[PDB]
Ligand binder design. Structure first.
Ligand SMILES: Nc1ncnc2c1ncn2[C@@H]1O[C@H](COP(=O)(O)OP(=O)(O)O)[C@@H](O)[C@H]1O
Ligand SMILES: Nc1ncnc2c1ncn2[C@@H]1O[C@H](COP(=O)(O)OP(=O)(O)O)[C@@H](O)[C@H]1O
Ligand code: BEF
Ligand code: BEF
Ligand SMILES: [Mg+2]
Ligand SMILES: [Mg+2]
Ligand SMILES: [Zn+2]
Ligand SMILES: [Zn+2]
Lengths: 185, 343, 364, 249, 370
DNA sequence: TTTTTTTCAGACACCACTGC
RNA sequence: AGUGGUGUCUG
């Protein structure tokens, strides 16, 4: 029902929340963009963090009974609760009304949540380049050009990095108006 | 350097571009249009990359020097811009301006924008080193006696037909407000693509924005124009001007008037004017005022001015603007009552 | 009107098309001409008075900009994107309460949102309400963005006191000044609103409300909802007049009118009103002094009436034209003496009453 | 420079001893309080024992340590700035610490250098009366076990006044917190106790600082009733005591 | 005497229903009608003088909105929500001491948490009291959420001077002005309270208390508590007259008459008598000045006299009909100048004595012999 | 040609740079 | 969060 029946260990949830937190924590443009979006679907938890420009999603496997619900809960409070609870504590979160109940062995919390229908989601788009790549190659591609990027330049296009897909190679380009860095692999 | 009004700037820009352009004056609109024209002409001759800086005690001069000396991967032909502060080239800024005057090159074009420079105070060094091969552009707000022909010229160059009535209405609502005046002409062109502006057309779509300085108020008092002085006083009230500045500005000329009227019994006003070092345009209006109900308003008005001064400088609730209205009405051949004068 | 009448008239009644706006004809006509002809400025600063529509006009202009039918002076009806501005939220239209987010960091986030493409609409439209409250650094960032804005970004600024905006911002913004609404326009719009709300209204109550609005339509709407509150779903003239008298604070002008007219019972009634309101008495004397001084200055020259007192122009004229300067002199002297002796009185109330009694007893 | 030829009391004290002595009491001082005598730490000397007392009228902290050298009973109030900077300069526990306290100024010879400060003129209150005189309820728990539960409860606590209600039942402790948003946190802990059900609402930051000051493994709390104070200390010693006076909310 | 009954009338008698208010009927009627019809505006402002029911009525409205039953103009007492509101510490009635939250960061923190749903009630009723303390930035920050807030958030503002608020906010929120209270309402409230407190009271005592409250009922309740403390838990004319430090109108009128009827020996005798009673001399001057002003007002119109001093009404009329207004003005000015010069008189007693002697010497119809 | 302002006390508001 | 500066507005 309303309870998005949810039950996971901390060891499999601390790192995903740490990744999903991202830019959240500060003052948001809209009051909802400080709440992680929790979704339950097909035996999987989806953690979502949005900044109206960036969208970080983490998937956690569910090996315990669950219910398909979704809601947005303050990110910092939920993360502080999650790491506060002891090692190996099987978090069990359910929902009722507009409050979700977090539970562990001999401990209970109640958190105020907002509906998932209001949380922004970046619209689906058609993709032209489906690209797969090893980790270290991307690491070097970024690290070899990140220094040459602009620093809050009045020219928007100077800020950021250029990705070029040409034939069998991928290229990273960076410029600040005086330097150019190119890395093609 | 070549000293120039905005009229011939285009022509000069067509002749050639100098090392540095100094856009100076108290008019935002004239400075802005001159800067836009300079940047467009520079872009025509390849000056593609632009930059901006605000000359401030907290500015990063090293960035300016680095970008002026070094060149970019693209658009080598570069231009640079600096906003001078309200006071001007501060004594802590003249030396670094001199360094820029050494750190220049034929590739870069420097644009200098700010208020008018007190040449009597600041000259030579930076000024002459630019004067070598530079342009000075004076962009100052046309005064009341000069604004109507400026507005007529602007209407002619924007393809509008302004009669005398619309011209004087526009010159009434917008003084020291040439930016909003140009915007008003643009809005009137937008409202009617006919391009023919009459009295009601401008009268409907106009606001009494204006911008006056206490000198305008004192001049209006000396000419004895009741409506003009009261409009100026209301405008400085709405603008938020400090009334004590008004008090001092009026007091200087009022005590000068008292001295002149007292000494005029032994000396003609010409030699008195020469004694006090007062200028010719000031001389005409002060001579007009000195023989306009004097020797009674010059002590009664000093009494009222002292009343306003003490009331302003004891409490903190002010409420002196009505008393300033009393002064505005006393010095304009409209005698007041002793009840309000004495208090 | 609505599903249970909790929905406020002020917010329920907000223009959704340019034609529903009351007669701020200047800005509407100029903006329609600019949109139809394609002449577009980078920024459109809107200003004027509270409750005269600057935020309404800015919202309608954003709807017209981002509507999928094209840049039109008339945003359409369904046009899902053009609908998202009113009901729900529109992705590309950013509405910022610059009063809540004055900091350069809060505006830094949005000015960094500038360079990203709009999602659905053509233009990344920004609606920055209360733009005068941005700090110096927020203004610097906004100016820097306004120097070279991309072709897909437009800024809509609304404010009540533009004098706090820097001239650098004003030079890049085509300011559209909205004039305070006339009593006729306010009264007509109130009449239409009440007629479409199926609210029983008396014609005189509308004029009373419009006069009490002081030119702001939202003031009229709030007073109208309150007048419906003071009663049972009907805007009766007696109830509206009683409510206005309860809310009335124009005591000094009425006191001067009744004292000059030598109406002792009316003067004492007005003093009772000023007492029941808990109004300061020295402030009352100061207000009467200022009114008499202004009346005299008007008698000397008609230009003495500024735009700060547009509400009480007529009465002032009536008092300046009909009362000789000698009587005004005597009354000003009497009230000055009374305010001088106010602290040494049985209480401030009796001191003010006795000063007004003296002024009446003069009968000059 | 040194015109304080005569000193009221003298100490040759190990650095670690006074480090613990101040660290166990520093957080309970008053910062810029109107009661100028509370804007400081009271050093009290009796027998071979030196005590630091700090209170702001909402929490008391007393910590006593033996010296071995008999000293006359004396009291002194060292201001906030002086004690804080003395704590900052109190490093390198190898070197001993000399303390020289007169009637108007205090000197601390640390390592090789000398520190000087003035005194607060006022007279510090008697902390014995603040300590509950009839503790009838005594409970024990684990220091880390109790502290982590308080931290978890404090997560969903009123950010303005961090206050929790502590309930005590037979071998059971309860900590309940709520914020203006009604977000409720509830932690239940297993303790050893014998008494009667009782609720008491007190600040969280003060209790957490008390627990952090007691770097121990067993903690004893002594309580009298719902309105009086709570005396918290460790079960392995009686040299450090803390008094938390609750809220009436 | 009694037990720890410390609970003072000022707070113990805070109204708890709309039937227990002393007659801010222009406010109560509007609130009741709007709450009955459902036209619950999202933000409005009770503005008045001190102690006339702004905060109290705001709490009553919160009770009316958050009652367990349907939204009603008459709050209940058996309901849990209203019980919590009355006892304080309600989940949703967020009282905001605006003089402690003037800053704009506090207002921003308030506005961030606005969109959160109410926990137990149906409204998250923000009750901002003493709003005029908010800074300009705080007001402008509140502007947008005051235009249209979430459907569950209501703003209840309360302030003493509504003119210090920026007029944009005065547009956003409704305005209800609570006027001061007539003497009859204050005295009836004091009567009712002392009936419920089992404290014997006298009529003249309550009339004097209601006169000296100055139109506000909180001043009346503090004065009543002070009078009960002055007596042995009993309200009497002697106790209230000693507490207020005033005179019975008969003595003041006797002295004023002795001044008017040129009975200087009677003036001296009544001055000595007032010296015996240990009453302040400036109080004597103020009371004579008040009586002279009342005579002048009667000269303006018969309806000037209030019922509170009805005992001397007849004499007032007589002294109003006997003395033309110029002499009343002369006496009032002489006594006013005497009071103004009293601090610099050698002694306050002889200062008042010489003020009276001057009012007697400059007597037009019967000057002191030369 | 320029020519333009008193004051003591207090309350906010924003923005470094530090310091964790 | 501590410290220091700018600046604006209230009596
Ligand atoms: N020109 C107008 N036409 C219709 N309603 C208006 C107009 N101006 C103001 N209002 C009313 O006032 C309310 C608030 O208007 P708003 O445009 O926000 O004023 P502001 O200029 O101060 O931001 C609107 O909901 C509308 O009811
Ligand atoms: N209309 C009223 N009816 C009854 N008592 C009142 C009224 N107004 C004020 N009081 C008395 O004043 C006390 C405090 O009133 P309060 O409502 O706080 O005034 P305020 O508007 O200044 O906050 C109340 O406890 C009550 O005894
Ligand atoms: F929203 Be407005 F400027 F009052
Ligand atoms: F809220 Be009141 F002014 F005591
Ligand atoms: Mg607005
Ligand atoms: Mg109150
Ligand atoms: Zn559309
Ligand atoms: Zn109820």
């Amino acid at each position: 029902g309303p309870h998005m029946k949810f039950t996971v260990e901390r060891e499999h949830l601390l790192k995903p929340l740490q990744q999903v937190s991202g830019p959240l924590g500060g003052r948001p443009t809209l009051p909802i963009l400080g709440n992680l979006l929790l979704q339950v679907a097909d035996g999987t938890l989806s953690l979502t963090g949005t900044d109206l420009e960036m969208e970080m999603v983490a998937r956690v496997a569910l090996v315990q009974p669950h219910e398909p619900g979704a809601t947005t809960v303050p990110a910092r409070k939920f993360f502080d609760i999650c790491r506060g609870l002891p090692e190996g504590a099987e978090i069990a979160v359910q929902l009722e009304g507009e409050r979700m109940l977090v539970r562990s062995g001999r401990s209970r919390f109640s958190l105020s949540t907002l509906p998932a229908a209001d949380f922004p989601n970046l619209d689906d788009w058609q993709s032209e380049v489906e690209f797969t790549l090893p980790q270290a190659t991307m690491k070097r591609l970024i690290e070899a050009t990140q220094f040459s990027m602009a620093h809050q330049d009045v020219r928007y296009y100077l800020n950021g990095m250029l990705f070029e897909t040409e034939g069998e190679e991928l290229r990273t380009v960076a410029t600040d108006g005086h330097r150019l860095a190119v890395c093609s692999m | 350097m070549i000293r120039l009004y905005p009229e011939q700037l285009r022509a000069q820009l067509n002749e050639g571009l100098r090392a540095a352009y100094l856009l100076l004056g108290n008019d935002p609109l004239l400075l802005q249009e001159s800067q836009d024209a300079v940047r467009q002409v520079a872009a025509a001759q390849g000056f593609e990359e632009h930059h901006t800086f605000s000359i401030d005690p907290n500015t990063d001069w090293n960035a300016i020097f680095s970008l002026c000396q070094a060149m970019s991967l693209f658009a080598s032909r570069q231009t640079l811009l600096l906003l001078l502060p309200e006071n001007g080239p501060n004594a802590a800024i003249n030396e670094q301006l001199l360094t820029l005057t050494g750190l220049l090159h034929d590739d870069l074009l420097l644009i200098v924008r700010g208020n008018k420079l007190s040449k009597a105070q600041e000259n030579a060094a930076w000024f002459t080193a630019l004067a070598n091969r530079s342009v000075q552009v004076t962009c100052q707000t046309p005064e009341q006696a000069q604004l109507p022909r400026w507005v007529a010229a602007r209407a002619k160059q924007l393809n509008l037909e302004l009669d005398d009535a619309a011209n004087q209405v526009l010159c009434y609502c917008y003084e020291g407000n040439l930016l909003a005046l140009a915007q008003a002409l643009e809005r009137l062109s937008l409202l009617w693509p006919d391009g023919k502006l009459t009295l009601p057309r401008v009268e409907q779509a106009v606001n009494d924005a204006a911008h006056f300085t206490p000198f305008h108020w004192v001049d209006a008092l000396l000419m004895g124009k009741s409506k003009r002085a009261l409009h100026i006083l209301q405008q400085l009230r709405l603008e938020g001007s400090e009334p004590v500045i008004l008090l001092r500005t009026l007091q200087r000329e009022l005590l000068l008037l008292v001295n002149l009227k007292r000494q005029s019994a032994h000396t003609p006003l010409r030699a008195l004017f020469d004694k006090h070092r007062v200028w010719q345009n000031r001389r005409g209006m002060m001579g007009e005022a000195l023989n306009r109900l004097s020797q009674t308003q010059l002590r009664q008005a000093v009494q009222l001015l002292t009343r306003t001064e003490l009331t302003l400088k004891q409490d903190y609730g002010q409420s002196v603007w009505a008393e300033l209205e009393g002064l505005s009405l006393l010095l304009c051949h409209k005698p007041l009552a002793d009840v309000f004068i004495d208090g | 009107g609505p599903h249970m009448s909790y929905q406020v008239l002020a917010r329920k009644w907000r223009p959704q098309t340019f034609a529903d706006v009351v007669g701020q004809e200047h800005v509407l006509t100029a903006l329609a001409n600019g949109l139809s002809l394609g002449r577009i400025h980078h920024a459109y600063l809107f200003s004027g008075t509270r409750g005269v529509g600057k935020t309404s006009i800015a919202r309608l202009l954003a709807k017209g900009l981002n509507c999928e039918t094209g840049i039109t002076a008339t945003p359409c009806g369904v046009c899902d994107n053009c609908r998202e501005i009113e009901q729900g939220r529109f992705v590309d239209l950013i509405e910022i309460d610059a009063a809540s987010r004055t900091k350069v960091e809060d505006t830094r986030d949005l000015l960094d949102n500038v360079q990203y493409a709009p999602a659905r609409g053509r233009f990344k439209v920004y609606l920055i309400d209360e733009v005068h409250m941005l700090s110096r650094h927020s203004f610097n960032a906004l100016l820097k963005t306004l120097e070279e804005p991309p072709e897909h970004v437009k800024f809509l600024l609304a404010t009540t006191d533009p004098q706090k905006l820097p001239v650098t911002i004003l030079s890049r913004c085509l300011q559209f000044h909205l004039k305070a609404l006339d009593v006729e326009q306010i009264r007509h719009q109130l009449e239409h609103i009440l007629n479409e709300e199926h609210i029983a209204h008396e014609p005189r109550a509308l004029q009373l409300l419009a006069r009490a609005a002081e030119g702001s339509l939202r003031d009229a709407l709030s007073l109208t909802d309150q007048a419906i509150a003071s009663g049972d779903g009907q805007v009766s003239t007696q109830a509206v007049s009683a409510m206005l008298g309860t809310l009335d604070d124009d005591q000094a002008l009425s006191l001067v009118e009744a004292m000059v007219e030598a109406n002792g019972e009316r003067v004492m009634a007005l003093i009772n009103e000023a007492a029941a309101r808990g109004i300061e008495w020295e402030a009352l004397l100061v207000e009467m002094l200022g009114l008499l001084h202004r009346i005299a200055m008007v008698q000397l020259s008609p230009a003495a009436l500024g735009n700060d007192m547009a509400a009480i122009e007529l009465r002032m004229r009536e008092l300046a034209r009909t009362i000789p300067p000698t009587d005004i002199q005597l009354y000003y002297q009497t009230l000055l003496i009374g305010r001088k002796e106010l602290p040494y009185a049985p209480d401030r109330r009796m001191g003010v009453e006795m000063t007004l009694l003296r002024a009446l007893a003069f009968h000059p | 420079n040194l015109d304080d030829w005569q000193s009221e009391v003298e100490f040759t004290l190990p650095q670690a001893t006074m480090k613990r002595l101040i660290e166990a009491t520093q957080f309970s001082m008053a910062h810029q309080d109107v009661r100028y005598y509370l804007n400081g730490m009271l050093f009290e000397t009796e027998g071979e024992e030196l005590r630091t007392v700090a209170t702001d009228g909402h929490r008391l902290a007393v910590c006593s340590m033996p010296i071995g050298q008999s000293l006359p009973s004396h009291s002194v109030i060292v201001p906030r700035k002086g004690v804080i900077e003395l704590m900052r300069m109190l490093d390198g526990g190898d070197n001993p610490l000399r303390v020289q306290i007169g009637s108007n100024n205090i000197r601390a010879h640390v390592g090789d250098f000398i520190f000087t400060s003035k005194l607060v003129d006022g007279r510090f209150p008697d902390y014995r009366r603040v300590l509950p005189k009839n503790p009838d309820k005594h409970l024990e728990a684990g220091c880390d076990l109790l502290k982590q539960a308080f931290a978890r409860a404090a997560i969903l606590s009123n950010e303005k006044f961090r206050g929790v209600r502590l309930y005590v039942s037979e071998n059971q402790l309860k900590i309940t917190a709520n914020n203006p948003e009604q977000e409720e946190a509830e932690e239940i802990l297993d303790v050893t106790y014998s008494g009667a059900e009782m609720e008491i609402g007190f600040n969280v930051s003060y209790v957490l600082d008390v627990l952090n000051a007691l770097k121990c493994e067993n903690v004893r709390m002594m309580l009298t009733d719902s309105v009086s104070s709570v005396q918290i200390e460790d079960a392995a010693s009686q040299s450090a005591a803390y008094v938390v006076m609750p809220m009436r909310l």
